[PDB]
């Protein structure tokens, strides 16, 4: 986040990288 420009491509980055799979979420450590 610089101004406002990175800020928000790096949102929408890090918001898109959060989900990637999503498999009803990145839990994976569900039943160990």
């Known amino acids: 986040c610089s101004n ?3 800020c ?3 949102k929408l980055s890090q ?3 959060k989900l990637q799979t999503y498999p009803r979420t ?3 450590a569900g039943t160990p």
């Open 4 to 6: 406002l420009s990175t």
């Open 8 to 10: 928000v491509l790096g």
């Open 15 to 17: 918001e898109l990288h």
């Open 26 to 28: 990145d839990v994976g």
